[PDB]
Amino acid sequence: LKEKAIPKDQRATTPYMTKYERARILGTRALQISMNAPVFVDLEGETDPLRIAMKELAEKKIPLVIRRYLPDGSFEDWSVEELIVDL
C-alpha cells in the first residue's frame, strides 16, 4: 500500500520539531558533514561538524525530511526547512 503516505494538506502532527528530531537532525548532518559531505551554509570559520550542522539548521539549509510514523504505519513527511524550532 501507499495509502501509507498522509498528504501535505490534511496532516496533523506538531508543526514544531521534537527534541529527538532535532538531536537526530543535528547528529545526522554532523555525521554527513564529518564524512566530507557538501555543506550548504557558509562556515564562517567553523570546524566542529556539530557546530556546522547547527549553523545549517539555524539557516534552515538542511536538505533532510522527517518521516513521522503513526501507530498504524502511516506517515507524514515534514521538512527540516518547514518545522518550527522553538526548543
Added chain:
Amino acid sequence: DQENERNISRLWRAFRTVKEMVKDRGYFITQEEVELPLEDFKAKYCDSMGRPQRKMMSFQANPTEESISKFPDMGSLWVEFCDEPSVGVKTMKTFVIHIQEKNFQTGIFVYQNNITPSAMKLVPSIPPATIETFNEAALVVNITHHELVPKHIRLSSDEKRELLKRYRLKESQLPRIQRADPVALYLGLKRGEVVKIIRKSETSGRYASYRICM
C-alpha cells in the same frame, strides 16, 4: 414493626435503582417516578395488611424520543419482579413468552434469592430478544452513584466506527471492559459495544477514555 419494615425499605431502595437504571439506559422515566417516596410505595404495592406485592411492581418502559434518533432499533423493555424468593421454570416460562408475544427487545428479571438452572436454560432461548437476570440485593445501592464511578456513555454503531476511524484503531487496540463489569451490566452492554468514559482529571479538567465490551 420488626424486620418487615427494613425488608420493605430495602425493596423500595432497590426499586428506585431499577427505575434509575432504566431511565439511564435511555428509557422514558420521570424524575417523579424515581423520587417516589417510601410511604407512596407501601400505598401502591402492599396487600391486605402491608406485605410487599412484587407481582404488581413489574413494568414496561419505552425509549425516549432522543434514544430513537441515536438507537432506532432499541425497542421497549420489560422489567419483572417475583414474589417467590426462588424463581422456577414454571414462573420463568410465563415471563419468557410475554417478551416473545409483546415483541419486546429486552427483558429484565429482578430475582430475590435464586433462579434455578432449569429456569436459567430459557435465557438465550428466545433471540434476537435479550434477557437480563438481576439480584434484588445487588440493586439496593445504585453503584453508578459512587464517588469513584465516572460517567459511562454507550456509543452507537456510527459513534464507535468514527472513534476507531479518528484514532486509526482496531477494536483490539481499545482499552476493554468485561461484559460482567457492574457498570457494563447497568447499561446493558452487549459484546463489542463501546462505552465513552468521562472522568474528572487533576491534570486536564475533564478526560475521556473509551472501553470496548467483551
